[PDB]
């Protein structure tokens, strides 16, 4: 679930408004995403991606047949650091960790404005 993923990124990157800034970026931030990541910040996404391809291979994610893209785990934010609650069970726990490494990834790398809204031909 996305209500919570965008909350992660505003936890870490506060002046952020992530649906707005980190959408449509380089080859991977946004749905689908092909070719080679244009920058680190895009690789970030490139990775988060493989992490949701991952999850769904999971057997738990299976027989809850769960929706990553609908994953409703639970995390907490404080003093700008993230914790996905122990209460998350095998699947949405995985999913929680995907959004978590990506969200930090992002706080961690430079934001080249010129690959914001890249053209799917550069990919």
Give catalytic status of residue 48 as yes or no.
yes
DSSP code per residue over the chain: -HHHHHHHHHHHSTT--HHHHSSSBTTTBSSS--SS-SSHHHHHHHHHHHHHHHHTTSHHHHSS---GGG----EEEETTEEEE-TT--HHHHHHHHHHHHHHHHHHTS---GGGBT--TT--
| Elucidation method | X-ray
Name the binding residues. 28, 30, 32, 49
Give the residue extent of every domain in the chain.
Answer: 1-123
> Which CATH number fits the domain 1-123, given the four candidates 1.20.90.10, 2.60.40.1180, 1.10.10.10, 3.40.190.10?
1.20.90.10
Q: What is the distance, to the nearest Å, from the Cα of residue 75 to the centroid of all Cα atoms in its chain?
A: 14
Q: How many CB atoms are located within 10 Å of the residue 120 CB?
A: 11
Give, in degrees to the nearest 5, the angle at Cα 108 between 89 and 123. Answer: 90
Which one of the listed residues 39, 48, 66, 115 is annotated catalytic?
A: 48
Q: Is 115 noted as a catalytic residue in this protein?
A: no
- Binding site for Ca(2+), by residue number, is 28, 30, 32, 49
Catalytic position from the list 21, 39, 42, 99 = 99
Closest among 62, 113, 120 to 91, alpha carbons compared: 62
């Amino acid at each position: 679930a996305l209500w919570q993923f965008n909350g992660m990124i505003k936890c870490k990157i506060p002046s952020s408004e992530p649906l707005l800034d980190f959408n449509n970026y380089g080859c991977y931030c946004g749905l689908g995403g092909s070719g080679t990541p244009v920058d680190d910040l895009d690789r970030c996404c490139q990775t988060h991606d493989n992490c949701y391809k991952q999850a769904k291979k999971l057997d738990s994610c299976k027989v809850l047949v769960d929706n990553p893209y609908t994953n409703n785990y639970s995390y907490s934010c404080s003093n700008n650091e993230i914790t996905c609650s122990s209460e998350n069970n095998a699947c949405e726990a995985f999913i929680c960790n995907c959004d978590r490494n990506a969200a930090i990834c992002f706080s961690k790398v430079p934001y080249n404005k010129e690959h914001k809204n890249l053209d799917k031909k550069n990919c």
